[PDB]
Amino acid sequence: HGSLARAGKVRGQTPKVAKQEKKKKKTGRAKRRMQYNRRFVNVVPTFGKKKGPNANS
């Protein structure tokens, strides 16, 4: 059985959005500098019960 009408229902009706543009992200070896720097030497503040590197506030 089964109606094959519903193939691509969801991509179909999800309202598309623009992908924006700001920063051409730094790459290669500078990326990795920015990386270490931003979670090793720099901030390393008074601990706030573990981190959340991509978490919310």
């Binding site: 094959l4 193939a7 691509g8 229902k9 969801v10 991509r11």
Partner: protein
């Protein structure tokens, strides 16, 4: 226990020999059957013609219709169901269109739901679903 002796290199070899036709993973590989049975004649992928589009009903705990393709392989003329992966891609594939069907990753096991479907479609008229469902390469005409 084991035979353990010093001129017992054979009773041992010949012991550890036959007590592999009780392994499962070798009796696929070394017997014959596999090469004889799998429509994919020992071959990673294979080409075949889309003869119709068929929805399959998933295994109870997860209700849904899976959206696969009855294929007939060129080399054998052996038929197949292949689940066309990723959303709304069955919409792309039309009848009688030449598809490159690869496995599922379980090598013979059917994957998860999709009861009794080993194969997944990859290409369609020398394109690749990954390019179509991203909208990079369009349908040929």
């Amino acid at each position: 226990g084991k035979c353990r002796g010093l001129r017992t290199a054979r009773k041992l070899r010949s012991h550890r020999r036959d007590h592999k036709w009780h392994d499962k993973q070798y009796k696929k590989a070394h017997l014959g059957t596999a090469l004889k049975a799998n429509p994919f004649g020992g071959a990673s992928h294979a080409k075949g013609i889309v003869l119709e589009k068929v929805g399959v009903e998933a295994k109870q705990p997860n209700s849904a219709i899976r959206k696969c393709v009855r294929v007939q392989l060129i080399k054998n003329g052996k038929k197949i169901t292949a689940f066309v992966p990723n959303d709304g891609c069955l919409n792309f594939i039309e009848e009688n269109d030449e598809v490159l069907v690869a496995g599922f990753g379980r090598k013979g096991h059917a994957v998860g739901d999709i009861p009794g479907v080993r194969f997944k479609v990859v290409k369609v008229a020398n394109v690749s679903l990954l390019a179509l469902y991203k909208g990079k390469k369009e349908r040929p005409r």
